[PDB]
Amino acid sequence: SLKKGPFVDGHLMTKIEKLNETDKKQVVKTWSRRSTIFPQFIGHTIAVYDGRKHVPVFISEDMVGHKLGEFAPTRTYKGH
Amino acid sequence: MAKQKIRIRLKAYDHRILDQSAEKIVETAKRSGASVSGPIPLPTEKSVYTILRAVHKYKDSREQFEMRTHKRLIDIVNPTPQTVDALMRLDLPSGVDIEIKL
Amino acid sequence: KGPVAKRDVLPDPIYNSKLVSRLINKMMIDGKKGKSQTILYKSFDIIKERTGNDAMEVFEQALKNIMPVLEVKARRVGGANYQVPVEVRPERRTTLGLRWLVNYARLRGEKTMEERLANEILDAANNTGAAVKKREDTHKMAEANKAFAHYRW
């Protein structure tokens, strides 16, 4: 993105407006990988597509703009 | 100055259709008035583009097909509106491009 | 295939030099002949203005003391051969002198390879040094085996 702007997931934007709207929902799968974490979508758990199964990622406060699919591990390590 | 001269430029695949077909295209310019200009020869551009001439291996042993397409031009001087509208009776060739550019 | 000879060059910029025209033909490296013409003309003004004397006499005495005579032509029956004595021909004379004076003098290490190369040719003007030391070097290796490999070729 360059200027307009940070590209939200859409489906993750609906789940973030809903679960971040109220009640502070618990972590489930979220098969998207496109955008980052959001301002209001913090706190939750993204069990995003690690390729085989999910991986519980924290909705932290340090990775403000960092990619929500970047927190997961892509290729199975390590290693030799 | 002059008038905006009526002359159709020719485009052809090979070079003999523009030559001979430009000849009979000057045969349309003999009648219809007068002042049919001669063979203003175009730049005669080509295209050279080669592909890998093997099935799977042999990446060095390529091959280069290249097919050029350029033809001459003709622009008449004297107006002759009856022959100018009479230029639509174009009979030849099979492969040739006529377009009255005036 | 036979002896297929080569062509020479025309007269130089300053002034009408021909063997020094071959000196400019060796004077460049990597094609850009303008930089070689500049460094060569700088050697001409550096050695003809500084160290007050002429130009064609100075180069004629440097390469005139640089153009060797004998040389080492290898051979053998196999292992442990004998480096035969093989004297130079004329164009091999000027070519070998251009090789020794160029490849020795441009690798000196002064402030510039142009003025420092002129200093290497000027030290070569004393009949010794880098290029004259090489002419004595090959001139000394041959005639060390000039009593055994002489009449073989």
């Binding site: - | 099935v55 091959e63 097909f65 097919m67 397409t69 | -």
Partner: protein
């Protein structure tokens, strides 16, 4: 997978940057000529048999 591969490559793309070029006579990927409208093997065989003017080759 020639039928689903070439037939799916004939269908409508997903995004606008999804439509990738296909093979002309044989639906191969990998360098179908966009200006001659044929593949490499298709341009070679169909061009040598007579397809448009013209040959091909060996200037330059």
């Amino acid at each position: 997978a020639k039928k689903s591969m070439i037939a799916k490559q004939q269908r409508t793309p997903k995004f606008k940057v999804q439509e990738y070029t296909r093979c002309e006579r044989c639906g191969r990927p990998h360098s179908v000529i966009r200006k001659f409208k044929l593949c490499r093997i298709c341009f070679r065989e169909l061009a040598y048999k007579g397809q448009i003017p013209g040959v091909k080759k060996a200037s330059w």
